[PDB]
Amino acid sequence: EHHHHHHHMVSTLKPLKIGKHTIKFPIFQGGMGVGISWDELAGNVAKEGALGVISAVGTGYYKNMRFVERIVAKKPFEALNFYSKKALNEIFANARKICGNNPLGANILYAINDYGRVLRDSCEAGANIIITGAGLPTNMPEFAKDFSDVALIPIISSAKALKILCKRWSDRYKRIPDAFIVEGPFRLENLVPKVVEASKEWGNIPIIAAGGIWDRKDIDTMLSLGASGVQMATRFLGTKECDAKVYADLLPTLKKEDILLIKSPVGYPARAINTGVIKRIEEGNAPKIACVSNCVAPCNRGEEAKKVGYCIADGLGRSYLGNREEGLYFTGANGYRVDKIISVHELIKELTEG
Numbered sequence: 086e087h088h089h090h091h092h093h094m095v096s097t098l099k100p101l102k103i104g105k106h107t108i109k110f111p112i113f114q115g116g117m118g119v120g121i122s123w124d125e126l127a128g129n130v131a132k133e134g135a136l137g138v139i140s141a142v143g144t145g146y147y148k149n150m151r152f153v154e155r156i157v158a159k160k161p162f163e164a165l166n167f168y169s170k171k172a173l174n175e176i177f178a179n180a181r182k183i184c185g186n187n188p189l190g191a192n193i194l195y196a197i198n199d200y201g202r203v204l205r206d207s208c209e210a211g212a213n214i215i216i217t218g219a220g221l222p223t224n225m226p227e228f229a230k231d232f233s234d235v236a237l238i239p240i241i242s243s244a245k246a247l248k249i250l251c252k253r254w255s256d257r258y259k260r261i262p263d264a265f266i267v268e269g270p271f272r273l274e275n276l277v278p279k280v281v282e283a284s285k286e287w288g289n290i291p292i293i294a295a296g297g298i299w300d301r302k303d304i305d306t307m308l309s310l311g312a313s314g315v316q317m318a319t320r321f322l323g324t325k326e327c328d329a330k331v332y333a334d335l336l337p338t339l340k341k342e343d344i345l346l347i348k349s350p351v352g353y354p355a356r357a358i359n360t361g362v363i364k365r366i367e368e369g370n371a372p373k374i375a376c377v378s379n380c381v382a383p384c385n386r387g388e389e390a391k392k393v394g395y396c397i398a399d400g401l402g403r404s405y406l407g408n409r410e411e412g413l414y415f416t417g418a419n420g421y422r423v424d425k426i427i428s429v430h431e432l433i434k435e436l437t438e439g
């Protein structure tokens with residue numbers, strides 16, 4: 086008993102309009118770097134009618150630095166090669182060999198260096214939607230002016246941030262966000278109604294709930310609270326089509342006690358698997374830190390990486406390249422609930438049937 090792409094699926098979930106774009110199911114696959122949500126994952130998610138989201142961070146690592154001009158110590162040299170336009174273009178092109186013209190997003194952290202350049206690169210590569218968190222992105226329209234149809238979606242954690250972003254954008258660009266993703270840094274079941282309420286002032290911008298959403302019962306709860314859709318990362322992290330192939334080996338064995346919150350050179354906490362570089366640091370076998378890729382502004386070219394003990398660009402790139410000893414591995418809080426690695430098709434069927 087296997088459901089295939091030529092079979093029908095009956096859903097009571099309704100299509101979701103984001104700006105000029107429509108997705109069949111009110112579900113975003115959350116962007117995941119480095120190299121977790123590239124062409125295979127994002128293309129297959131979009132093929133199924135959810136929003137596939139390509140992570141635009143660290144694209145220089147794609148296919149072992151296929152598209153970088155300069156390499157240093159096996160790393161992309163500087164932001165121009167770490168956020169590689171040519172790699173981003175090929176990732177989008179390969180996604181669309183799978184999903185065609187179905188909508189695709191690009192996720193870009195606001196804290197990266199060359200943020201505006203990577204936003205414009207994402208539009209030029211074919212992104213229909215830009216998603217940005219890790220900051221308060223008050224100038225997203227500045228870099229998208231040449232791409233009127235690309236929808237812009239900040240990630241926020243409060244109704245105050247919604248009101249601020251809508252006012253700043255409206256006053257400066259005569260435009261407001263096309264959607265908001267709401268995530269806790271405070272429980273999601275109390276944040277969503279507050280943000281939904283605040284959006285009323287600005288025209289019922291769709292609100293996408295994110296964080297800890299696992300199954301259709303969680304989706305239904307979120308829609309009942311006024312959310313227009315959900316964003317899910319960890320569930321897709323555990324699919325076969327994930328572009329970082331180590332996770333299919335790592336998640337099935339992952340126990341709750343091995344998930345932990347850590348500091349980062351970006352100045353935002355991350356949730357990591359207690360393995361790889363995190364174990365190397367505690368042994369006193371930490372990899373050398375010497376900023377090559379210059380990934381994020383808050384680090385100041387290695388100042389903060391040296392303080393917290395690891396380089397996030399180096400560690401996340403090593404994981405994409407298959408490095409179990411020195412890679413950095415992330416997970417949502419529900420990562421320990423992954424037992425089987427299933428297909429994207431199987432997952433979407435589970436989340437949408439009925």
Ligand SMILES: Cc1cc2nc3c(=O)[nH]c(=O)nc-3n(C[C@H](O)[C@H](O)[C@H](O)COP(=O)(O)O)c2cc1C
Pocket residue numbers: 115116117118119121140142192193194217218219240268295296297298316317318319320322414415416417418419
């Ligand atoms: C492996 C991994 C990589 C991530 N990378 C990004 C990223 O590049 N950009 C971003 O906005 N969020 C990133 N996140 C956060 C997720 O997009 C998402 O907000 C959070 O994990 C979703 O909650 P869930 O995993 O509970 O569904 C990442 C999460 C994981 C697990």
Ligand SMILES: O=C(O)c1cccc(NS(=O)(=O)c2cccnc2Nc2ccc(Cl)cc2Cl)c1
Pocket residue numbers: 117118119142143194219296349351353354355356357380381397398401415416417418
């Ligand atoms: O909520 C959770 O459980 C959760 C679990 C894991 C990650 C996140 N958020 S995060 O955006 O990924 C993130 C946070 C903190 C520092 N860095 C980050 N990302 C990042 C930075 C630089 C590069 Cl070069 C690449 C990437 Cl991916 C949330």
Ligand code: SF4
Pocket residue numbers: 350375376377378379380381382384385386387388390395396397398399
């Ligand atoms: S040293 Fe800091 S800015 Fe440089 S690549 Fe590493 S985390 Fe990024």
